[PDB]
Structure 1
Amino acid sequence: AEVTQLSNGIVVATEHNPSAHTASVGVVFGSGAANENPYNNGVSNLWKNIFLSKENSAVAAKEGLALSSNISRDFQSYIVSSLPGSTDKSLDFLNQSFIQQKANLLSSSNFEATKKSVLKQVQDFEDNDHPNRVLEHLHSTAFQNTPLSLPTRGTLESLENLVVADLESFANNHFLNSNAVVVGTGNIKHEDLVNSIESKNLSLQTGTKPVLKKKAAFLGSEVRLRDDTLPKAWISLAVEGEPVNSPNYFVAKLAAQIFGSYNAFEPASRLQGIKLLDNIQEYQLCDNFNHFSLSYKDSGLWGFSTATRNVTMIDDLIHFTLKQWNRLTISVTDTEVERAKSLLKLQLGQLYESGNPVNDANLLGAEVLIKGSKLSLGEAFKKIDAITVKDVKAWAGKRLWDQDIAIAGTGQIEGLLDYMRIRSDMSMMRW
């Protein structure tokens, strides 16, 4: 009823949900793509896929279990889902995969087949997923030569050069008890899980701490992947944002909610209380846009992504959007701040109070790894309601006004002006 957190060597964290009809048990490691290098980039993604390999999944399915794995920038997860009663069967599989097995999943035929699978996977993403590919390039240029610049799926070049040894090296260096948290969500009790874990013994690399490196840094820059054969222009643009556990974490998320998301083809989306919408609908400057406040351990990105077929008016799209951002520093109104509060609460509620145990597992593990605990919506909502117009203006004057930007784009971006023209729009002339 408040999320329990116990440690006996292995940190166990659970979140009991009485309305849930299933249960998820897994392990979340405090290491992701941000802990790789340009040459082993994609190793985590390769691990995810061998864990989700047919051999491993068939074994789990026979037991009535479903496997899930997510590779993020700061973390990595491996979850098993089952009925509330088969919760102990999940632990056995989990125990087996990360303690008993090794040479079973890393066999020549399984590794090569899995490698070939992720290779075609990544190739398709880079070849067809334009909005996400652009967002990945935003991170790449914004944090270039820094941990946060590496794509989570890895790069084709490094992927084709990866061997079983690379996987093992990463596992020995990151899949450690000191860098992990065993999570339990859905319909399960803490005692049931802690005792079932405390039932077994061993340690498997005890006291071993993960590798350390240099911190993430934001660099005003841009990467342009022009492709005149594509039907649209896809653009992502952002300034240095807030890291997780930043004092302005919510103020930044609220600022992003002010401008929000938009889908020109959805009737209700066109009626939102967003001033930018009055400027962009007259000549239909875009098909959609979405503002974000991405937060990581060392840094973050605040900005937006947009897609448009109006290739001759991209300059107006960017101009109007950045002119609106200017407003956060000098003229954002009370009702805009109040509307943002309500919608932010709804966003967080939908994110944290989702009816999915695997989602809760990922969120719970990631947070307890970073701050040792998980913040409740009750506390989050209180912080949000305390945000004032002066807080937004103070934050904007620091993060937005006359600040460097990172830009990424693909498709028909001839109309996207030079860096300086876009950068100049981060402020307004004053007397």
Structure 2
Amino acid sequence: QPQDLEFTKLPNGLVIASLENYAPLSRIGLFVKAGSRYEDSNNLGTSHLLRLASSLTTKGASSFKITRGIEAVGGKLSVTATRENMAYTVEGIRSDIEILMEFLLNVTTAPEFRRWEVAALRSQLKIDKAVAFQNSQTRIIENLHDVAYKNALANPLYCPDYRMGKITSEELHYFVQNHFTSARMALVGLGVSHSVLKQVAEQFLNMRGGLGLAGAKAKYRGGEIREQNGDNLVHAAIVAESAAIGNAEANAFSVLQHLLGAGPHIKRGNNTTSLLSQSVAKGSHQPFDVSAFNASYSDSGLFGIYTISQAAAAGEVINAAYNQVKAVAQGNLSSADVQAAKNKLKAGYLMSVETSEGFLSEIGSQALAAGSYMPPSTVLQQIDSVADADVVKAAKKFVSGKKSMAASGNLGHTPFLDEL
């Protein structure tokens, strides 16, 4: 007997969301508005060490006790972080989630941050950054955010090279005390009852309840940065400012990326409904990969094109992709293409929420954003409420706005922003 989602907002600001579906493995996550955008130039990379410091000694359980107790029941504790949000998630058998909530709420609420532990963790910070930047997409997206924004969203997800060896226990304590407050936290549980979740919520985090430290508004700057590193393929992202979280223009931009192309649906396919892929493939016979990039955060968004191409043919491919968006900015589109884009977007949303951890991430993000769970059918009808003129308006907003460009590879034939 699966019931519906059930929500209470506690008077200290903490959101509690629960769903009891009688799953054999139950999953409990806690969502904090403490991403990398809340740092400044004095404590860069603190959120990366905080993300990697989830298995440290807490006031209530040591590192040995936390690690051996989570592995004793076979449960899993993971930390996922975006530029806005952090989420600490535990999952396991229903008979062990009491001590799993003990461990998770101890980790969230009462860390110790001993100096020898963080001194041991900084080498793991370097190793994690190297493993993350082993692929070109991660480096080019970090570079794109750094050149696109000025202060808030320009902060990297991974710690800079100079800041390793300089992050202290006091910076971690200050970050936790200024951003891990009850008004910025949602505790979301799939496979758990409401009563046990709300009672462990009221007997763990009953000491902090404020709004925390407010972050600065993100400011666009634009520009371009180029990384000549001699790779075989040229990666290039060209974006502009777009809509934020909470507007119908964000829905228009999502429909616009699914019209332009947002990943292959067929293994080794040709992408014959992707306008960018068709416009490149009608002129270039070299291997390529052209898609549309959209990343929207609660105050600002980035929308643009992403290209991977050969070094000799890096130019006109980018130009071809850009020209295709200009055609969409001129009204050159068909209603069947927009209907197929809407179907692709809604199928992608439903397959994103069909898994348990994706469902928990969606519920936690919605509880942080608004404090209530929006049903999927209303999301479907608000996707269906997007018109063609909104897609044309989003395309002309992209082509009229000033650009941020991140390029990497052999950039001898990669064009500049003024040459576009």
Answer whether TM exceeds 0.5 for this pair. Answer: yes
SS in 2 for 1:51: coil
2-structure distance, mates of 1:303, 1:135: 12
Query: Residues 265 and 180 from structure 1, CA distance in 2 versus in 1: closer, same or farther, beyond 3 angstroms?
Result: closer
1-structure distance, mates of 2:194, 2:222: 46
Equivalence map 1:53-64=2 (5 Å):
55=64, 56-64=66-74
Q: Is residue 327 of structure 1 aligned with residue 327 of structure 2?
A: yes
Out of 169, 176, 179, the position equivalent to 2:184 is 179
Paired residues of 1:63 and 1:89 also in contact (CA < 8 A): no
Paired residues of 1:286 and 1:306 also in contact (CA < 8 A): no
The one-letter amino acid paired with 1:393 is: V
1-structure distance, mates of 2:376, 2:416: 42
1-structure distance, mates of 2:266, 2:28: 40
Q: CA deviation at 1:52?
A: 3.9
The one-letter amino acid paired with 2:9 is: S
Q: CA deviation at 1:17?
A: 6.1
2-structure distance, mates of 1:201, 1:74: 24
SS in 2 for 1:374: coil
Paired residues of 2:115 and 2:168 also in contact (CA < 8 A): no
Which TM-score applies when normalising by structure 2? 0.90
1-structure distance, mates of 2:108, 2:137: 35
Identity %: 18
1-structure distance, mates of 2:180, 2:52: 16
SS in 2 for 1:94: helix
Deviation sequence 1:322-361 (CA, Å, 0-9, x none): 11111222212111101101100111111122x233x333
SS in 1 for 2:399: coil
* Alignment partner, residue 23 of structure 1: 26
Q: CA deviation at 1:24?
A: 1.5
2-structure distance, mates of 1:131, 1:165: 33
Which TM-score applies when normalising by structure 1? 0.88
1-structure distance, mates of 2:35, 2:307: 27
Paired residues of 1:314 and 1:415 also in contact (CA < 8 A): yes
Structure 1 stretches lacking a partner, 5+ long:
423-431
Q: CA deviation at 1:284?
A: 3.0
* Alignment partner, residue 60 of structure 2: none
* Alignment partner, residue 85 of structure 2: 75
Equivalence map 1:244-255=2 (5 Å):
244-255=245-256
Aligned-residue RMSD, C-alpha: 2.3
Q: CA deviation at 1:68?
A: 0.8
Paired residues of 1:34 and 1:147 also in contact (CA < 8 A): yes
Structure 2 stretches lacking a partner, 5+ long:
57-62
* Alignment partner, residue 297 of structure 2: 296
Query: Residues 161 and 202 from structure 1, CA distance in 2 versus in 1: closer, same or farther, beyond 3 angstroms?
Result: closer
Q: CA deviation at 1:110?
A: 2.2
Paired residues of 1:24 and 1:81 also in contact (CA < 8 A): yes
Paired residues of 1:242 and 1:294 also in contact (CA < 8 A): no
The one-letter amino acid paired with 1:333 is: S
2-structure distance, mates of 1:120, 1:338: 45
Q: Is residue 188 of structure 1 aligned with residue 187 of structure 2?
A: no
Deviation sequence 1:108-134 (CA, Å, 0-9, x none): 4321221110112213434x3211110
* Alignment partner, residue 375 of structure 2: 376
Deviation sequence 1:353-407 (CA, Å, 0-9, x none): 2x233x333332222212222322211110111222122123323x223221110
2-structure distance, mates of 1:96, 1:219: 40
Deviation sequence 1:174-217 (CA, Å, 0-9, x none): 111122111212x223234224434x2662233x3211243112
Query: Residues 259 and 20 from structure 1, CA distance in 2 versus in 1: closer, same or farther, beyond 3 angstroms?
Result: farther
2-structure distance, mates of 1:17, 1:166: 38
The one-letter amino acid paired with 1:111 is: V
Paired residues of 1:292 and 1:303 also in contact (CA < 8 A): yes
* Alignment partner, residue 59 of structure 2: none
1-structure distance, mates of 2:291, 2:42: 32
Q: CA deviation at 1:149?
A: 0.3
Deviates more, 1:2-11 or 1:310-319: 2-11
Equivalence map 1:106-117=2 (5 Å):
106-117=113-124
Q: CA deviation at 1:285?
A: 4.5
Paired residues of 2:15 and 2:371 also in contact (CA < 8 A): no
Query: Residues 212 and 195 from structure 1, CA distance in 2 versus in 1: closer, same or farther, beyond 3 angstroms?
Result: closer
Out of 129, 135, 146, the position equivalent to 1:129 is 135
* Alignment partner, residue 391 of structure 1: 390
* Alignment partner, residue 405 of structure 1: 403
1-structure distance, mates of 2:417, 2:41: 26
The one-letter amino acid paired with 1:242 is: A
Query: Residues 236 and 285 from structure 1, CA distance in 2 versus in 1: closer, same or farther, beyond 3 angstroms?
Result: farther
Residues matched between the structures, number: 408
1-structure distance, mates of 2:166, 2:281: 48
2-structure distance, mates of 1:383, 1:152: 31
Deviation sequence 1:293-329 (CA, Å, 0-9, x none): 2110110111122222x21111111111111111222
Deviation sequence 1:70-127 (CA, Å, 0-9, x none): 121111111111113323222211233244x533xx234321221110112213434x
1-structure distance, mates of 2:4, 2:242: 30
SS in 2 for 1:110: helix
SS in 2 for 1:224: strand
1-structure distance, mates of 2:278, 2:105: 56
